[PDB]
């Protein structure tokens, strides 16, 4: 999987609305026939983010599958100038490239440092769709389910996940600390979501805790929950 | 009901631990035989708070019943100097007195201004005991239940509440916004609790919304949830 970070001179505009606009610009680069293909799965092979800085603005694009990477990676590198609505033509100052393959993930598993406590940071508005209406309070079952689904569909090409494992992961995980707040994401239907940081503990074998760490490490690329392609659900597993 | 606010020169000490210490000092003033009586109900006729300020420290004591007020009110007024463990002898600079009776509550009901949105501020660590273990994420059912129980036991002398009303109040209330964080209260067993602010909307008749406003206004005195007498569950309904 690939992680591309486009750096612009600091853009004075509400970050959440850039993410939606950047997503539109991104679609205008791909073959329209290929775009319609992306609209026919529960999970897209890409996730985007927008991080505002003190002196810069960063557009993050995650390539999550090899097939998607094969047809898109070169195109994204050619990008030097971006033009969005109501905004002056943007110039790409830098482009960073990081990669996350099986070698790094498997390394995470057999690590000498096995974590019991895990701190998740919700950089962008994160939401879940459960039992009809939306969700404003995150739960471990919803977090693990979204990641297990995203992982199963993208790298294993399997429609459904192991419910016993989801039960097992939820029974042994418990939120201990959090600092959260509401944050609505505009797609223009306002979508309810949350933002901030939480901490949970895992009680069990080191083989279990390793799977959690891997699932979270993978999550930093795919994003967590709803509308990850539009800029939602950007997470970060702190050291 | 009475609201006494004791003002000291700013005390350099963790506010949550003062609340526990002040509670001990408060018990050392009452008849030991009368103290044992307080330990024999699910709800105490008093609630305490500790609010840290920039230049002052405020000790709040709520008298919730007439009988408790009759035997305690005069004693609390005589207090000019307070001595707690590991602390220099404290001197009472001021003492403020406010009252909340049926006249103010009934006034709240027939108000010309009927609220749909309600913002609750959790000044001190608030916790609920539900289905065995504790609770870190507040819910409208837990909030209304605690207040309905506290109100029913204190002014109506009724052991249980109307479950249909609790169902009715929960079905029509919905959290829309919040800014919350974990905050453990030390009683020394660490008790998990939350802190901050939330906002919920009420969908229904004005008679329903008036009952909610009254219940919340009453809640500013009794406190919300667990261990209100020890300094927990101090709330504030903003204008
Ligand atoms: Ca990381
Ligand atoms: Ca008030």
Swiss-Prot record, chains A, B:
InterPro entries: CRISPR-assoc_Cas6_C (IPR019267), CRISPR-assoc_prot_Cas6 (IPR010156). Its EC number is 3.1.-.-. Pfam families: CRISPR_Cas6. Signal peptide: none annotated. One of its GO terms (biological process) is defense response to virus. One of its GO terms (molecular function) is RNA binding. It comes from the Bacteria. Gene3D superfamilies: 3.30.70.1900. The keyword Nuclease applies. Coiled coil: none annotated. Keywords: Antiviral defense, Endonuclease, Hydrolase, Nuclease, RNA-binding. Belongs to the CRISPR-associated endoribonuclease Cas6 family. CRISPR (clustered regularly interspaced short palindromic repeat) is an adaptive immune system that provides protection against mobile genetic elements (viruses, transposable elements and conjugative plasmids). CRISPR clusters contain spacers, sequences complementary to antecedent mobile elements, and target invading nucleic acids. CRISPR clusters are transcribed and processed into CRISPR RNA (crRNA). Encoded in a type III-A CRISPR locus. Part of the Csm effector complex that includes at least Cas10(1), Csm2(3), Csm3(5), Csm4(1); the presence of Csm5 and Cas6 may depend on the processing state of precursor crRNA. Csm with a precursor crRNA does not include Csm5, while Cas6, the enzyme probably involved in pre-crRNA processing, is found associated with a subset of the Csm complex that is probably in the process of pre-crRNA maturation. The Csm complex is elongated and slightly twisted with a maximal length of 215 Angstroms and a diameter of 75-80 Angstroms. This is CRISPR-associated endoribonuclease Cas6. The gene is cas6.
